[PDB]
Amino acid sequence: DCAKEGEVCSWGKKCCDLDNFYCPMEFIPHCKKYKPYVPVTTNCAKEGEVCGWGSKCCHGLDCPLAFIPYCEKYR
């Protein structure tokens, strides 16, 4: 037997459908669904704009490591 959606997992029983549900780390976890992989297209910085300070680079770009980074196209 195994836990279902919304039931307390990891206190003696795991959840079965791992391809659709996961048991979080909250000290009384409840199995919940994975969120969809929705890309970021709005409220994001474009290439050449400032990254990191309050806005992530859009899904097609990557943010370098710097004090004041700027979005660049990853290779």
Binding site: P24, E26, F27, G52, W53, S55, C57, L65
Partner: protein, 533 residues
Amino acid sequence: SYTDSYYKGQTALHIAIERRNMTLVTLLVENGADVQAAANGDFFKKRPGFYFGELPLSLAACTNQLAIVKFLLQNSWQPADISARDSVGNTVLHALVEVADNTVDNTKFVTSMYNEILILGAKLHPTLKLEEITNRKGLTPLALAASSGKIGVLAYILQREIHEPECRHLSRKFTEWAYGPVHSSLYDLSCIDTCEKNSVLEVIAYSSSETPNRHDMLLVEPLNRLLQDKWDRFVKRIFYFNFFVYCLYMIIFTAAAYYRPVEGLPPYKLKNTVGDYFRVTGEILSVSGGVYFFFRGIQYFLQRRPSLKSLFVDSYSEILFFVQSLFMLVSVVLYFSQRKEYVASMVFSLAMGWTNMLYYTRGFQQMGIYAVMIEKMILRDLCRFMFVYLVFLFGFSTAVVTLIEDGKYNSLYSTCLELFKFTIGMGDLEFTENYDFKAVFIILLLAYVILTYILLLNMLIALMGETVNKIAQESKNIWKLQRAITILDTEKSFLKCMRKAFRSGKLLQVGFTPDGKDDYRWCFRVDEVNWTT
């Protein structure tokens, strides 16, 4: 005589003794003054004031006015009653013990006055057991001195010598025989171990821990050798036997828990096979020990009744064993309730069941000092460190969760664990995720790490200031006190017609009491060598 509640009961004799003027004392006694008048005003009670026993005799004794003491007890007009009692229930000896403060000059004064008063009282009233008069609480002067921590007075009383005819019976240190460099002393240890009211070992061992010299009072000459004699006689074998039995219990419990069945929905049917018979035998023998510890941990509390303060100051191991037994009982209840969570309880009673084995480090000195040091540092310094660290960690965790609300930082619990990992040294300074507030998160983590390392370094350095001839000396006395407590606990019950706890036997010490009777004192023999002869 004053009638005001502040000075109630004060009369001319108290003022005369206060002024250190013998002339007024003589005149007052000649005129029929009441030498038994009690000064019952608040100023003289045990806040401002000075407690002396309320009587002129104890006032003269407490103010080092020996001439007035001699006059009051022996004047022809009205001699004072040496056995008089105050409102509290104390007499001259109790008040003289009370004014001690373990300073050098005051200890000298108290000892000299005590000896002189005892000798004079014995001379005036040979049939009066002046030292055996208990106060309202039921304590004799020796018991009161031991209870209140008057180590200077105890050290005198336990080994006093009085070399005067018709007064040698008052002493309790004697000589049995002598050779040249070697001789043999003989201590009278009446009411040191067994008196049925309150012995010196009992009052020292089971005190409230408020006494400032609780650890030092066991360093006197007779008690240390008595305890070492008791340990090397019969207690050592009993302690080792109990340690062996506990080891067997833990081995059986571990073996039974290791081979638990893996199927769900307990209870499990017993198979008609050898291994399962051994398994269920192990389970029964594992539960019985929990029942035993549960009952013993109740019997401890009922026979002591601590006032909810010393529980976490002394006798911690009783609490730890009791908690182990509670976990075992909860495991049993969950097992027979058809719940799988019983394993979660069982392993806890297993996991601490090994750590409580450190309780048996005592009896082995080289490990006992180490264990005492562990307990000292844990209860002293790491509590302050953990308090400060936990508040700091909570602050930075709530700072981080507010900034990054997804990707391992969408809850306080996960953020706390991820930040705690840095203290161990297992961090995740990768910064590969595409957060909204990257390049601020880095500053928070760097500041957190630096502050946490500063705190750890401060803790470490602060612990070095307690190594300069502080811990090394203290831990030895604490260990000796622990061995004394376990010896007394073993001796107390024993339920087997006690003979081995007794001292050298009914030896004739003097054989000539003030009357025609002899005396037997249940003494203790201590040999000694001295080349300055």
